[PDB]
Design an enzyme around this catalytic site. Sequence first.
Site, PDB file in Angstrom:
ATOM      1  N   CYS A   1       3.358   1.499   9.661  1.00  0.00           N
ATOM      2  CA  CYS A   1       3.225   0.406   8.677  1.00  0.00           C
ATOM      3  C   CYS A   1       4.587  -0.054   8.217  1.00  0.00           C
ATOM      4  CB  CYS A   1       2.371   0.835   7.488  1.00  0.00           C
ATOM      5  SG  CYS A   1       0.697   1.345   7.932  1.00  0.00           S
TER       6      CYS A   1
ATOM      7  N   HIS B   1       0.800  -1.229   0.000  1.00  0.00           N
ATOM      8  CA  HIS B   1       0.000   0.000   0.000  1.00  0.00           C
ATOM      9  C   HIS B   1       0.838   1.287   0.000  1.00  0.00           C
ATOM     10  CE1 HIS B   1       0.084   1.181   4.293  1.00  0.00           C
ATOM     11  NE2 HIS B   1      -0.092  -0.100   4.621  1.00  0.00           N
TER      12      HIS B   1
ATOM     13  N   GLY C   1       2.098   5.870  10.270  1.00  0.00           N
ATOM     14  CA  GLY C   1       3.523   5.852   9.938  1.00  0.00           C
ATOM     15  C   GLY C   1       4.251   4.603  10.437  1.00  0.00           C
TER      16      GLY C   1
HETATM   17  C1  LIG Z   1      -6.825   6.067  11.771  1.00  0.00           C
HETATM   18  C2  LIG Z   1      -5.418   6.587  11.496  1.00  0.00           C
HETATM   19  C3  LIG Z   1      -5.190   7.906  12.230  1.00  0.00           C
HETATM   20  O1  LIG Z   1      -5.352   6.874  10.084  1.00  0.00           O
HETATM   21  C4  LIG Z   1      -4.371   5.545  11.897  1.00  0.00           C
HETATM   22  C5  LIG Z   1      -4.075   5.311  13.241  1.00  0.00           C
HETATM   23  C6  LIG Z   1      -3.250   4.296  13.627  1.00  0.00           C
HETATM   24  C7  LIG Z   1      -2.651   3.443  12.669  1.00  0.00           C
HETATM   25  C8  LIG Z   1      -1.825   2.343  13.015  1.00  0.00           C
HETATM   26  N1  LIG Z   1      -1.282   1.513  12.135  1.00  0.00           N
HETATM   27  C9  LIG Z   1      -1.524   1.744  10.835  1.00  0.00           C
HETATM   28  C10 LIG Z   1      -2.309   2.786  10.337  1.00  0.00           C
HETATM   29  N2  LIG Z   1      -2.579   2.980   8.961  1.00  0.00           N
HETATM   30  C11 LIG Z   1      -3.611   2.474   8.237  1.00  0.00           C
HETATM   31  O2  LIG Z   1      -4.475   1.735   8.714  1.00  0.00           O
HETATM   32  C12 LIG Z   1      -3.644   2.922   6.775  1.00  0.00           C
HETATM   33  C13 LIG Z   1      -4.270   4.327   6.644  1.00  0.00           C
HETATM   34  C14 LIG Z   1      -5.759   4.283   6.924  1.00  0.00           C
HETATM   35  N3  LIG Z   1      -6.408   3.293   6.070  1.00  0.00           N
HETATM   36  C15 LIG Z   1      -5.786   2.117   5.690  1.00  0.00           C
HETATM   37  C16 LIG Z   1      -6.525   1.136   5.021  1.00  0.00           C
HETATM   38  C17 LIG Z   1      -5.927  -0.052   4.637  1.00  0.00           C
HETATM   39  C18 LIG Z   1      -4.587  -0.247   4.901  1.00  0.00           C
HETATM   40 CL1  LIG Z   1      -3.840  -1.756   4.450  1.00  0.00          CL
HETATM   41  C19 LIG Z   1      -3.830   0.710   5.549  1.00  0.00           C
HETATM   42  C20 LIG Z   1      -4.425   1.898   5.972  1.00  0.00           C
HETATM   43  C21 LIG Z   1      -2.908   3.674  11.285  1.00  0.00           C
HETATM   44  C22 LIG Z   1      -3.773   4.742  10.935  1.00  0.00           C
END
Ligand SMILES: CC(C)(O)c1ccc2cncc(NC(=O)[C@@H]3CCNc4ccc(Cl)cc43)c2c1
Lengths: 296, 303
Positions: free
Chosen positions: B145, B41, B143
Site C-alpha cells: 500500500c 488507512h 505491505g
Molecule cells: C488479503 C491480504 C493477505 O490481506 C492482502 C493481500 C494482498 C494485498 C495487496 N495490496 C494491498 C493489500 N492490503 C489491503 O487490502 C488492506 C488490508 C486488508 N483489508 C483492507 C481493506 C481496505 C483497505 Cl483500503 C485496505 C486493506 C493486500 C492484502
Amino acid sequence: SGFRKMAFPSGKVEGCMVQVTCGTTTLNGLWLDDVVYCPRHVINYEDLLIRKSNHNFLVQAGNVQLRVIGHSMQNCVLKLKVDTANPKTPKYKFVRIQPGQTFSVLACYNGSPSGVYQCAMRPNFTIKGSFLNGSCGSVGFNIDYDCVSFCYMHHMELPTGVHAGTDLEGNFYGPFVDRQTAQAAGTDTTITVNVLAWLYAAVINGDRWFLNRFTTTLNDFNLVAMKYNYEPLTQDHVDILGPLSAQTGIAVLDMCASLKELLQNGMNGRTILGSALLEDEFTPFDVVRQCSGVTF
Amino acid sequence: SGFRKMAFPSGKVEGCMVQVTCGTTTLNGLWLDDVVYCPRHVICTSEDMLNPNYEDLLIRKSNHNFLVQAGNVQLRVIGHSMQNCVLKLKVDTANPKTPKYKFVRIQPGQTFSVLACYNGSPSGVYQCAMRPNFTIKGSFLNGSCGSVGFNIDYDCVSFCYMHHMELPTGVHAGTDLEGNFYGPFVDRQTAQAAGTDTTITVNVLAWLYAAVINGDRWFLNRFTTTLNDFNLVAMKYNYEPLTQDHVDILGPLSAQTGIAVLDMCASLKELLQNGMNGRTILGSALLEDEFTPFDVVRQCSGV
Ligand SMILES: CC(C)(O)c1ccc2cncc(NC(=O)[C@@H]3CCNc4ccc(Cl)cc43)c2c1
Ligand SMILES: CC(C)(O)c1ccc2cncc(NC(=O)[C@@H]3CCNc4ccc(Cl)cc43)c2c1
Ligand SMILES: [Cl-]
C-alpha cells in the site's frame, strides 16, 4: 495476489547511461567510474581503432561533454577512459549468464533511457527484445541486494527480429559476430525449468485446474519433452524447484506429469495466469522473489 | 523490431519512496518536496477498517505519532492533513531528489508503470492499465500500500495512481494522488467487488496496428464494417464500445499502415469469431488490450 513480468528498478543503471558518437555513428555507453563501455562497432577493428584519436570519440552525459583521455578494446567492447569518474557509479559486478536465466533491460536512445522490460536469454542465445536503430549499447542487468550485476550489452538485430549481444567483457552470447554478414538464430527451444516455475506460481495464485493425481520419472518426462522442443530437465533443475515444491505440496515430478498432459492435450479453452501459452521467461528464483516481496 | 510490455525507467520515482509507520502499521509514502503522501488507512487497525471514522482517528494523532523513514534517515513530521483518502504529512526536509512532476487523474484504458515497494524500498517495476471496471490487475502483496503508478513522457513524472487495497478476486483498487478512488470503491473492509470487466477495444486495435507495423498481416480480411455493426458484435464478446473518439485517436496508426480503422475493426470481428487457429500475434495467443494507441506509437518504428 497477481503475477506480472516484473523488471528490477532501473534507477542505479539510469545514472550510468551516456551517448557515444564516433563519426556518423551514435549509440549508448555505460559509464562506471572513469570508463565508458560501448560496442566496438561504433568505430579489422585493430586497424580501424589505431587510426582514431581520443578526441574522435564524443561522449555526452546529460548536457555535459566528457573528455576521452584513453581507449582500449576488450573482445567486442570498446573501453573509453574519461577524465571524470561517474559520481553515480553503483556497487557493481560484470557477470556472464547462462541460457534460461532472466534479466532486466534498460532500452536507451541517444544516451537517454526510454523503457525497462524483463527478458530471458533463450537456449539459442538470442533475446526476444524490443529494440530499434540507435539502441546499441543498451544493457541487461540483475540486482542482488544493493549490487548491480551487468550481464548484457546490446549489439545487433537478427533477420527474424530477435537480438544478439555480449557480456560486459565483450564476449558474444551465441555463435554471432559483430559485422554485416549472413547470420541467423538457431532453432529455439522452451526453457522447461522456467515453465514448471510458472506453473508453481499459478498454483500459489489459486490456478489449479491442471493438477492431476499422476507422477512420472525424469527419464519418461525427458522423452516427452524432447518431442515438443522443450529443453531437457536435469536433476539440478529438480533440486532448484525444491522450495516451490515444498510451499505448494506438489512434487517436481508430479508437476512434470501436469506439464506432460498440457503438452499432449493443450489448455482446452482455459488460461493459466491470464495466458493461453505456457510461459518460460520466469525462473524459479523470479517466482520466489515476486511471491515474497524482495526489495532493492 | 519486437514488441514488449515496456515500463518507464523507475529512477525518478525510486528517489521519492519512503516508509511510513503509525502504531503497528507500516506502508509506503511518496516524498515530493516537503510533503509525504500516503493512504489514510495507515491510521487504522484491522478492527477500524469495518467502519472507520477517519476524522475521529486523525484528531487523536499528533505529528510525532507518524514515523517517516527515507533510506536510513528519519524525517520529522511537522504537520498533517487529510485530502480525500490520502494523508499528507508535512516534513522538515524537502526531498532533494524531487523530480519535475504533475498529479494526473487517468481514464479507464490508460496504461502506466507501477513501482511496487515494501517498507519504503522498491522491489520491481511493471506495466499495467486502468481496467474499464476501474481496477488494476497488479502484482501486490501485503505491505505494498502506498506504491505508485506513473508515466514519464519527457522529463516530467505524471503520478496517476496510489495503491490502497486488494479486492476478493485478487485485483487491485486505489486512488489518484489527490486521494479520489478510481471506481465505486471505499477504503473500508466492506463487501465490495469488482464489476464485470470488459476488453479495452481501442487498445486491442492499437496492438493489431503494432503487429502490422512489425510485419504481420495474416489476420486482415477484405471486409469493412459500420461503427454500429462493429459495436453490436463487440458487445457480445464483452468488448468495450468503440466511440468516434477512439476512431479519431487511431488515425495516425491508420495512416502509417494504410488500413482504415473500420477495416481493422472488420479484422477484429473475424478474430473474435474464428480465434487464432494455432497462430500468434506479436508472440501472444490472446488479443492484448494493455497497450494504448500512444504506447504503440512510442515503442514501434515509424517505418
Ligand atoms: C488479503 C491480504 C493477505 O490481506 C492482502 C493481500 C494482498 C494485498 C495487496 N495490496 C494491498 C493489500 N492490503 C489491503 O487490502 C488492506 C488490508 C486488508 N483489508 C483492507 C481493506 C481496505 C483497505 Cl483500503 C485496505 C486493506 C493486500 C492484502
Ligand atoms: C534494420 C535496422 C534499421 O538496421 C535495425 C533495426 C533494429 C535494430 C535493433 N537493434 C540493433 C540494430 N542495429 C544493428 O543490428 C546494426 C545495424 C545493422 N547492421 C549491423 C551489423 C552488425 C552489428 Cl554488430 C550491428 C548492426 C538495429 C538495426
Ligand atoms: Cl487518461
